[PDB]
Symmetry: D3
Subunit: 265 residues, 6 copies
């Protein structure tokens, strides 16, 4: 599919998965993270750098034909860390791409951009943001920045609002939010194969009977997820306590993130 | 279903398909075209006439219980040819129907009525027209005329905006626009069986993963296409050159029609 | 699912089905009706009373963890009868629930709340009511009352606008309105399992190709009907007279109810 | 305008206003109420009857060319009183109208049909009901019944959702809900003069800067209210205590009605 | 505003008004009509020709900086006449403009493009067409053709759906459809002054209290009509017969045009 | 209206205006800026601090009952400066407010959050952001952060998307975007007087005939701007060159900001 694909956040949980699963997409896979990476094998390059370091990010991106941007802060943390990984880091990534041929980007956004919506409300891609903490706010920043680079320079980005990308659903909320490895992989393949992408919002979930999100406007991309969290409903009842109706886990799309305070260093 | 079914445009590529496939729908199939028709076999009648000749169209329609109107200009041509076949011709068809019991009509409209929309935009049946040439404008004329006859006289018409009704998808655009022979035939069967039809806009496409159009409002008809162009994606990448992202073929719903000039005779 | 489930209208056509099919949902099924009930078997309790009598309704509800409310008038009748079963009866039911722990309610509303809409119009859950008679108006009363108790007290109710819940479709309208026993049972299961329900409008139909109604906004519940009336189209055409296009049966969503007069005592 | 106009609820605060202001609209004004009416002057008839008494309502309506229906319960009361005045009473009114030439009806509905909406939400005429008590639910009943008589028999009704029809705004909520006497009178004049009315929902409010409701779809009637509660804002801050932000008065469109319990006799 | 402005249909009722009122907009006014024109005065040119004749239309347009296109058939007539003036004539006009610098066009479309909508329905600019006869269908053709030339060549046109442009309202329908001379003149001024126009639908009515149409989306143009037909209501009631509620005049937006047959030569 | 009102950015152009105009709103006006301020007069406190300095911001906010936040970067600048004033600065302001009683905030957002929309498109408050540079993106950050603090802590903020707040309109774009001093002052008064505000988007423009923005959903606030840029149209024609139709000034809502590159330090 391409000569060189960059995967950032490659030492993280999703990154380790994609390091294996996206190998067939490119002759060379370049893996990057702030954290130490397992050594490069055949057809791999490994890079260590902070997203907040502009010169390092420039070098990280140079020579890459595509980027799967998983690197950054995924859970609620103090502002200082979010600022570095998700705000400054995003600016540096977009500037680096702009300097090196505008390789297409798959951005790991988050359901936390809309975490304060009730689970009873079905959402299209144009709904106003309701971020459930600083992490969500920073993912909104990434989306707004990507949109600006698209309108201004034509840089294309898939804004993937990831639900819960896990080996299997493991609580009641994931019956709605589960995004299987297979379905995220197929989405990434669909994003890179498209002649024209634009800067679309993509709801990152499998084809769950209990899904909250409407991807119908993305029809042009031809991506239909195949897995379905509903198959795990009994598994969940037989492995977890029944949710309290007052629990954020079943009240808000962001789940317990709404209960987070502003964390401090 | 009925004693006699009229198929216009019967010499054309699509009409030749329907001459074969719609036979079971009527005791007699009347085939008509401006061009020479293969001679009538059993249970057939053949009539060669110009849609622009009112007296001929009156006789063509007389004694028919339904009409599949494929006849006319469906590619970009100079104004005079389109005026005769698609504007004068449509007036003549509707007047003929009005004089002979208002047989129900399946009208071959076209995606070219909306050809200037970007391929990234999903369309419902009520979107404003954006025709991509004179052919598209003339198909809009047919839709507007049909609506008027419906409101004024009760004449019922299915306004079928045909995508690409071909044996198989064979380019990137057809992954979205493909309308299988089987699915068009089943649509026609559903149109004629309905006790009440009205004058609905119908998107002429199969159940393609990459489809751009929303047929949900047509639910009352009970027609669900079964074919899916997505099955051909791999085959298409294996047997055709990758599209240029700048090509109208992958930018506009009307494809290369947007690039057509106004043709002169 | 629960210790004790109440099924009202248990002597009726649908009640007799649910008395059998809902047994696995609770340790004890309590059946109630105005009319005589077949004697209680193991795991059953049976009570005979009028919904219009508050003391009786209090006793009927006391000790129940959930209610499937089928009891009442579902065909057009004189106002006097409707007032007792569907208006006074509903007030009594909601007051009894409020006094006894607010057991979740599945309310048998009706398509007759929207019976005057044309069959050609697809409806979402928020459409304004267009009741086709006093029965329809009275089911609207139930919906409005339920919504008030939800907003004021937190009482949760599924407002199920039942189409045609029969063993099989047997006329043209039922190709659209059929609601299979299996699909109603699975809906009831999905309603009671949900940690959070609210007070949603639910369109009571199976997954019919010719369905008129949009349940997409109920996605959070994870209920997907599995039956399809379309399978019966051939049989219906074979075994029944073609509808006249002027017949209410094929013109209004409420079918022949629009033709009902106001019946008098 | 007409020979005889019926005004029900004529003993009430609003009815007393209309007894005076609507006199010019008819040769004879018939006033009716359950409560004692000031004796009839010239060009008046007075009738004292209960809306729940069908025979009385028949005689009340007989010989009338139009009806302004103000009679009934418009504050929260126990169920039985509301049942008699607003449910049985509405049935009786519509049946009486049906038996006597279908005189056009102005129905006093209420903002309480939508009382649970937040004051920050702007509402169009098609929003789903959110009644704030039994009074609101019963006013919804009137709206649903009127719609049914319209669709079934052609009876025309203006469904006027009255905000606060008082001499002057005197609290923060009335800056939004105020409906001047002048503007209600002009609305009634516009309703009766219209060749074609239908069964429209009308928001009963003056042209208030802080209004919550959108009457644009009623444009065809040519009624434009002229009064504006905003003129009273300064006066209100000068003569009343500032509202507590936690008070229902400034949180819900139904104001303090949301705080009402279910009243018992 | 410009050196030379063309006004077609200049011999007609509206043309004679604009010949006078638009004189200040250009150094030279060129007046054109099929029929004889009063002789050119200072600052005028007059040309007599049929829009169906391409050579003549080329000469008519050459050297003009803008066009107010009033010429054509605006009442119901046989298809032959409409074809010449409104279909062939429109094609000729757009081709002439394309060959001569694409002077901006104000097109006299018509309310008859939407004549079958009920008067009770408020319309925005995107509603599907519901033409009330061949004249209406032909004005739709003009709109669709204009839109194609805009998308394909950048030709800008204001599609003005004229209501009733008369010296004063003189029947009930005109209380809604009246478009004063002053307000049409100011619209034309706003159209020509705009740096960017596009191809907008414009509802051609004054600021009537009983208006049916929504021009809010045209806000960017900065045009606000100032006249109001409501001022004439009393006069109209005094001096004309009350409409029968069954009259097309008070039921359909196109008024009596819905009652027109298809006229024959 | 309050004991102490904070105005940030008080040395800037809008700040100097508000220092005078908002004086009557509070017993004490506290003015702050990174830049030196003219010395405090009677009833004034003057503070010098960087918004990026958390401790200083805490002290700035402490003791204030309301905040008009004008401080920050208003034009396109390099990322480093934007990061400090609009990103870090916003976090510090919200944290400081949260620590000191959550004084209500008027936030100076910007039209640049939606700068890439065409001027021909009318925008409601819920449209997706289309920021026209880093400044717009950073104003989006402020909006998203404010929304999160509202949902999480109940902090109330008016998100005022300022158009062009100048003494008078001085170019063609300002005929649409002008926000008079008087109208901004009255908006601020309305925001502080409201019992309940929430976190609404407010379009910051006067009542311009050529306005692009719809504030109708803010109706509850009772704020209606009184000035109208249209009065200056002739003034603009007689003081500036006519805009080129290709100029960003008349093509994009953000005007020439779309033409800005990413500026560097
Ligand atoms: O999704 P997920 O669940 O896999 O998340 P994760 O939290 O499991 O993965 C995130 C990855 O991004 C990295 N990261 C965080 N901040 C960074 C920075 N400033 N520069 C470079 N990398 C950084 C982490 O080290 C990490 O491996
Ligand atoms: O779709 P498609 O691919 O089948 O298109 P096609 O171009 O292959 O089918 C269109 C048919 O309509 C006919 N037609 C064109 N103008 C006509 C006229 N004026 N009168 C009668 N018939 C006319 C053509 O001869 C033709 O066979
Ligand atoms: O649905 P369906 O098709 O099964 O309807 P149905 O008419 O077949 O079922 C309705 C049931 O509710 C009962 N019912 C009617 N009014 C009642 C009242 N006032 N109090 C208690 N029960 C009452 C009936 O006796 C009946 O068995
Ligand atoms: O508005 P508002 O402020 O004028 O309300 P209101 O309470 O001041 O007006 C309502 C009127 O309707 C009457 N009414 C109530 N129940 C009735 C019944 N069952 N039959 C006949 N009339 C009845 C009342 O007596 C009253 O005068
Ligand atoms: O608007 P209105 O009320 O003023 O309509 P009108 O009927 O009063 O004005 C229409 C004008 O357009 C002209 N016209 C009609 N067909 C034409 C053609 N084929 N070529 C050139 N001009 C033509 C008419 O002669 C006429 O004066
Ligand atoms: O709106 P406008 O047109 O008046 O804008 P302006 O650019 O005219 O006003 C902005 C103000 O905010 C101030 N500002 C910028 N960055 C700051 C920071 N980091 N800390 C504190 N103040 C800062 C400026 O000094 C300035 O006076």
């Amino acid at each position: 599919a391409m000569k060189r694909l960059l995967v950032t956040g490659a030492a993280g949980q999703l990154g380790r998965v994609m390091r294996e699963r996206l190998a067939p997409m490119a002759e060379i896979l370049r893996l990057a993270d702030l954290s130490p990476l397992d050594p490069a094998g055949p057809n791999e390059e490994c890079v260590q750098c902070d997203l907040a370091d502009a010169n390092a990010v420039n070098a990280m991106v140079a020579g890459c034909d595509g980027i799967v941007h998983l690197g950054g802060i995924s859970v609620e943390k103090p502002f200082e860390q979010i600022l570095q990984g998700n705000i400054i880091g995003l600016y540096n990534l977009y500037e680096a791409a702009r300097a090196h041929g505008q390789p297409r980007i798959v951005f790991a956004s988050s359901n936390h951009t809309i975490g304060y919506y009730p689970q009873t409300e079905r959402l299209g891609p144009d709904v106003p943001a309701r971020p459930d903490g600083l992490a969500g706010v920073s993912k909104c920043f990434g989306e707004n920045l990507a949109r600006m680079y698209f309108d201004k320079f034509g840089q294309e980005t898939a804004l993937v609002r990831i639900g819960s990308c896990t080996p299997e659903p493991n609580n009641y909320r994931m019956l709605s939010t589960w995004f299987s490895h297979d379905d995220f992989v197929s989405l990434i393949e669909a994003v890179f194969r498209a002649p024209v992408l634009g800067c679309p919002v993509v709801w990152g979930a499998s084809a769950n009977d209990a899904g909250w999100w409407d991807n119908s406007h993305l029809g042009f991309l031809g991506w239909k997820p195949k897995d379905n969290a509903e198959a795990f409903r009994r598994h969940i009842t037989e492995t977890t306590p029944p949710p309290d109706p007052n629990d954020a886990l079943v009240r808000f799309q962001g789940g317990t993130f709404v209960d987070n305070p502003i964390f401090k260093q």
